[PDB]
mmCIF file of C-alpha atoms in Angstrom:
data_model
loop_
_atom_site.group_PDB
_atom_site.id
_atom_site.type_symbol
_atom_site.label_atom_id
_atom_site.label_comp_id
_atom_site.label_asym_id
_atom_site.label_seq_id
_atom_site.Cartn_x
_atom_site.Cartn_y
_atom_site.Cartn_z
ATOM 1 C CA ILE A 1 -2.436 4.666 -11.223
ATOM 2 C CA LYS A 2 -2.967 1.337 -13.127
ATOM 3 C CA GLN A 3 -6.296 0.124 -11.566
ATOM 4 C CA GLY A 4 -4.512 -3.279 -11.815
ATOM 5 C CA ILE A 5 -2.485 -6.011 -10.041
ATOM 6 C CA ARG A 6 0.881 -6.973 -11.675
ATOM 7 C CA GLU A 7 3.776 -9.418 -11.048
ATOM 8 C CA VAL A 8 7.377 -8.108 -10.697
ATOM 9 C CA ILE A 9 10.445 -10.376 -10.564
ATOM 10 C CA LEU A 10 13.387 -9.018 -8.507
ATOM 11 C CA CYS A 11 17.018 -10.103 -8.171
ATOM 12 C CA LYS A 12 19.131 -9.158 -5.018
ATOM 13 C CA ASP A 13 22.198 -7.030 -6.111
ATOM 14 C CA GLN A 14 25.896 -7.974 -5.411
ATOM 15 C CA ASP A 15 25.433 -6.848 -1.744
ATOM 16 C CA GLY A 16 22.211 -8.885 -1.148
ATOM 17 C CA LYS A 17 20.072 -5.657 -1.260
ATOM 18 C CA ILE A 18 16.820 -4.923 -3.186
ATOM 19 C CA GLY A 19 16.614 -1.255 -2.095
ATOM 20 C CA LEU A 20 13.167 -1.311 -0.445
ATOM 21 C CA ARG A 21 11.702 -0.333 2.972
ATOM 22 C CA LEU A 22 8.117 -1.580 3.604
ATOM 23 C CA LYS A 23 5.396 -0.302 6.015
ATOM 24 C CA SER A 24 2.331 -2.003 7.679
ATOM 25 C CA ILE A 25 -0.759 0.095 6.796
ATOM 26 C CA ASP A 26 -4.320 -1.071 7.616
ATOM 27 C CA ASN A 27 -3.112 -4.780 7.574
ATOM 28 C CA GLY A 28 -1.519 -4.392 4.162
ATOM 29 C CA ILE A 29 2.148 -3.843 3.227
ATOM 30 C CA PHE A 30 3.145 -0.680 1.330
ATOM 31 C CA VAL A 31 6.416 0.658 -0.205
ATOM 32 C CA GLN A 32 7.879 3.399 2.117
ATOM 33 C CA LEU A 33 11.181 3.805 0.152
ATOM 34 C CA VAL A 34 12.705 2.723 -3.193
ATOM 35 C CA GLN A 35 16.528 3.265 -3.209
ATOM 36 C CA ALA A 36 18.039 4.871 -6.394
ATOM 37 C CA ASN A 37 19.936 2.351 -8.683
ATOM 38 C CA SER A 38 18.494 -0.727 -6.833
ATOM 39 C CA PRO A 39 16.716 -3.882 -8.131
ATOM 40 C CA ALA A 40 13.433 -2.370 -6.791
ATOM 41 C CA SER A 41 13.813 0.799 -8.934
ATOM 42 C CA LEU A 42 14.933 -1.042 -12.143
ATOM 43 C CA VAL A 43 11.839 -3.326 -11.925
ATOM 44 C CA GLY A 44 9.705 -0.159 -11.434
ATOM 45 C CA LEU A 45 8.493 -0.423 -7.771
ATOM 46 C CA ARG A 46 7.009 2.945 -6.598
ATOM 47 C CA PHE A 47 6.396 4.633 -3.240
ATOM 48 C CA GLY A 48 2.815 3.848 -2.076
ATOM 49 C CA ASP A 49 2.688 0.524 -4.019
ATOM 50 C CA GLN A 50 0.980 -2.318 -2.107
ATOM 51 C CA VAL A 51 2.768 -5.700 -1.876
ATOM 52 C CA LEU A 52 -0.005 -8.404 -1.970
ATOM 53 C CA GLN A 53 2.462 -11.308 -2.169
ATOM 54 C CA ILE A 54 6.176 -12.120 -1.858
ATOM 55 C CA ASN A 55 7.133 -15.481 -3.409
ATOM 56 C CA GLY A 56 3.354 -16.245 -3.447
ATOM 57 C CA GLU A 57 2.829 -15.892 0.368
ATOM 58 C CA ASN A 58 0.077 -13.301 1.245
ATOM 59 C CA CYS A 59 1.342 -10.188 3.163
ATOM 60 C CA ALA A 60 -1.985 -9.405 4.976
ATOM 61 C CA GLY A 61 -1.446 -8.708 8.723
ATOM 62 C CA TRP A 62 2.385 -8.778 8.491
ATOM 63 C CA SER A 63 4.432 -6.409 10.714
ATOM 64 C CA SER A 64 6.902 -4.141 8.820
ATOM 65 C CA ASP A 65 9.606 -6.277 10.649
ATOM 66 C CA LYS A 66 8.192 -9.624 9.303
ATOM 67 C CA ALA A 67 8.049 -8.343 5.668
ATOM 68 C CA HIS A 68 11.762 -7.128 6.042
ATOM 69 C CA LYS A 69 12.822 -10.446 7.672
ATOM 70 C CA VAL A 70 10.953 -12.300 4.863
ATOM 71 C CA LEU A 71 12.933 -10.347 2.179
ATOM 72 C CA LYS A 72 16.223 -10.974 4.127
ATOM 73 C CA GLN A 73 15.626 -14.808 3.820
ATOM 74 C CA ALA A 74 14.521 -15.099 0.106
ATOM 75 C CA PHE A 75 16.824 -17.388 -2.077
ATOM 76 C CA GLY A 76 18.313 -14.339 -3.871
ATOM 77 C CA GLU A 77 18.219 -15.627 -7.526
ATOM 78 C CA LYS A 78 14.473 -14.848 -7.982
ATOM 79 C CA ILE A 79 11.895 -12.977 -5.811
ATOM 80 C CA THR A 80 8.374 -12.649 -7.314
ATOM 81 C CA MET A 81 6.150 -9.938 -5.836
ATOM 82 C CA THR A 82 2.465 -9.259 -6.536
ATOM 83 C CA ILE A 83 1.918 -5.422 -6.635
ATOM 84 C CA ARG A 84 -1.228 -3.256 -6.558
ATOM 85 C CA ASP A 85 -0.270 0.124 -8.070
ATOM 86 C CA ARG A 86 -0.276 3.091 -5.565
ATOM 87 C CA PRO A 87 -3.828 2.379 -4.293
ATOM 88 C CA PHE A 88 -3.843 5.415 -1.871
ATOM 89 C CA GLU A 89 -2.893 7.787 -4.754
ATOM 90 C CA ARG A 90 -4.657 9.619 -7.592
ATOM 91 C CA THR A 91 -3.306 11.403 -10.724
ATOM 92 C CA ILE A 92 -4.484 14.914 -11.685
ATOM 93 C CA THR A 93 -3.663 16.481 -15.142
ATOM 94 C CA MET A 94 -3.346 20.335 -15.316
ATOM 95 C CA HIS A 95 -2.335 22.997 -17.984
ATOM 96 C CA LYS A 96 -0.043 26.038 -17.162
ATOM 97 C CA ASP A 97 -1.579 29.455 -17.935
ATOM 98 C CA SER A 98 0.450 32.093 -19.955
ATOM 99 C CA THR A 99 2.215 32.974 -16.619
ATOM 100 C CA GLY A 100 3.445 29.299 -16.327
ATOM 101 C CA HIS A 101 1.062 28.692 -13.296
ATOM 102 C CA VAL A 102 -1.020 25.475 -12.614
ATOM 103 C CA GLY A 103 -2.646 27.334 -9.729
ATOM 104 C CA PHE A 104 -1.897 26.208 -6.131
ATOM 105 C CA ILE A 105 0.342 26.880 -3.049
ATOM 106 C CA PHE A 106 2.176 23.939 -1.362
ATOM 107 C CA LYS A 107 4.331 23.786 1.841
ATOM 108 C CA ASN A 108 6.748 20.909 2.815
ATOM 109 C CA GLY A 109 5.369 19.013 -0.241
ATOM 110 C CA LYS A 110 1.705 19.482 0.990
ATOM 111 C CA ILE A 111 -0.908 21.454 -1.102
ATOM 112 C CA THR A 112 -2.363 24.191 1.256
ATOM 113 C CA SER A 113 -4.516 26.328 -1.097
ATOM 114 C CA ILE A 114 -6.139 26.237 -4.627
ATOM 115 C CA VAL A 115 -6.028 29.555 -6.574
ATOM 116 C CA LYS A 116 -9.431 30.789 -7.859
ATOM 117 C CA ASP A 117 -10.025 30.354 -11.646
ATOM 118 C CA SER A 118 -6.875 28.127 -12.175
ATOM 119 C CA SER A 119 -6.333 24.775 -13.969
ATOM 120 C CA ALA A 120 -5.929 23.376 -10.379
ATOM 121 C CA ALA A 121 -9.477 24.663 -9.499
ATOM 122 C CA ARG A 122 -10.961 23.448 -12.833
ATOM 123 C CA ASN A 123 -9.506 19.903 -12.162
ATOM 124 C CA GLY A 124 -10.562 19.654 -8.457
ATOM 125 C CA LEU A 125 -7.085 19.528 -6.891
ATOM 126 C CA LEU A 126 -7.432 19.166 -3.120
ATOM 127 C CA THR A 127 -5.559 20.718 -0.175
ATOM 128 C CA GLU A 128 -4.252 18.537 2.740
ATOM 129 C CA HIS A 129 -2.690 16.218 0.060
ATOM 130 C CA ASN A 130 1.084 15.481 -0.215
ATOM 131 C CA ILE A 131 2.760 15.636 -3.693
ATOM 132 C CA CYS A 132 4.202 12.130 -4.383
ATOM 133 C CA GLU A 133 5.218 12.508 -8.043
ATOM 134 C CA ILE A 134 5.278 15.028 -10.991
ATOM 135 C CA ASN A 135 5.185 13.780 -14.627
ATOM 136 C CA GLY A 136 6.020 10.278 -13.276
ATOM 137 C CA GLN A 137 9.050 11.527 -11.244
ATOM 138 C CA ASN A 138 9.050 10.846 -7.485
ATOM 139 C CA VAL A 139 9.628 14.239 -5.638
ATOM 140 C CA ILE A 140 9.166 12.934 -2.059
ATOM 141 C CA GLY A 141 11.676 14.666 0.271
ATOM 142 C CA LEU A 142 13.071 17.183 -2.298
ATOM 143 C CA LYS A 143 13.141 20.835 -1.017
ATOM 144 C CA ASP A 144 10.028 22.903 -1.857
ATOM 145 C CA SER A 145 12.267 25.054 -4.114
ATOM 146 C CA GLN A 146 13.234 21.938 -6.194
ATOM 147 C CA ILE A 147 9.536 20.852 -6.607
ATOM 148 C CA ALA A 148 8.867 24.392 -8.039
ATOM 149 C CA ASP A 149 12.063 24.002 -10.186
ATOM 150 C CA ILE A 150 10.509 20.740 -11.686
ATOM 151 C CA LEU A 151 7.055 22.457 -12.190
ATOM 152 C CA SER A 152 8.665 25.504 -13.947
ATOM 153 C CA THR A 153 10.803 23.184 -16.178
ATOM 154 C CA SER A 154 7.797 20.879 -16.964
ATOM 155 C CA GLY A 155 5.887 21.359 -20.284
ATOM 156 C CA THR A 156 2.507 23.221 -20.242
ATOM 157 C CA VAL A 157 0.830 19.818 -19.329
ATOM 158 C CA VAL A 158 1.633 18.868 -15.665
ATOM 159 C CA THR A 159 0.631 15.466 -14.185
ATOM 160 C CA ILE A 160 0.693 15.411 -10.342
ATOM 161 C CA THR A 161 0.276 12.253 -8.270
ATOM 162 C CA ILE A 162 -1.143 13.073 -4.787
ATOM 163 C CA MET A 163 -1.987 11.318 -1.496
ATOM 164 C CA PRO A 164 -4.127 12.301 1.524
ATOM 165 C CA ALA A 165 -1.742 13.808 4.154
ATOM 166 C CA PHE A 166 -2.949 11.546 7.032
ATOM 167 C CA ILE A 167 -2.035 8.452 4.907
ATOM 168 C CA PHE A 168 1.192 10.074 3.686
ATOM 169 C CA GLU A 169 2.212 10.919 7.350
ATOM 170 C CA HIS A 170 1.334 7.321 8.423
ATOM 171 C CA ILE A 171 3.594 5.789 5.682
ATOM 172 C CA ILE A 172 6.755 7.983 6.229
ATOM 173 C CA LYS A 173 6.488 7.813 10.091
ATOM 174 C CA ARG A 174 9.826 6.608 11.652
ATOM 175 C CA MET A 175 11.874 7.473 8.475
ATOM 176 C CA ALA A 176 14.291 10.441 9.165
ATOM 177 C CA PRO A 177 13.771 13.306 6.629
ATOM 178 C CA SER A 178 17.462 13.080 5.380
ATOM 179 C CA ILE A 179 16.985 9.390 4.278
ATOM 180 C CA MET A 180 13.957 10.642 2.148
ATOM 181 C CA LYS A 181 16.074 13.450 0.465
ATOM 182 C CA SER A 182 19.309 11.311 0.244
ATOM 183 C CA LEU A 183 18.185 7.876 -0.932
ATOM 184 C CA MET A 184 14.460 7.865 -2.176
ATOM 185 C CA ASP A 185 14.733 7.275 -5.951
ATOM 186 C CA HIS A 186 14.052 10.721 -7.582
ATOM 187 C CA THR A 187 15.245 9.704 -11.126
ATOM 188 C CA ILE A 188 13.301 9.384 -14.430
ATOM 189 C CA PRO A 189 13.089 5.603 -15.159
ATOM 190 C CA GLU A 190 15.381 4.016 -17.836
ATOM 191 C CA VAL A 191 14.094 2.267 -21.031
#
């Protein structure tokens, strides 16, 4: 989480798409979905990012519909956005033990217990938090088995980006679970 505001410059693809769904939260506008291989992914937009401005208009108070309409009408060539980096999220750094464990139990992406005497305990991991990302990879809507796969295959250092469940459940509301698994960008970014 870059405790910072940043400018991104987007470019609608061949099909007039940017690969983004947006959600009204507490009179702000947040990223609900970033489509794999879209302009939004290539420029590095993330789930939970806040959109402060779109072509220099402020987003405060906008409906999800108005933000989507606004994107639908931009003159294609160049869209500037002002982003605040995942403001509802925090990063926690943990170390596997000899057994390969960081030291929690999660269900449907949501941490439900912290194992006594673990790296997860020592680092103050919380329950009732959804897993958004692991070592910078978005895991939102992957099966629980595939999130364990990624944790297993990670190096002894594991970085987990988490979000309070209430806020998580508010953001993904009215997005069908298949769209999350199918189309939410789960790739490592390209350099």
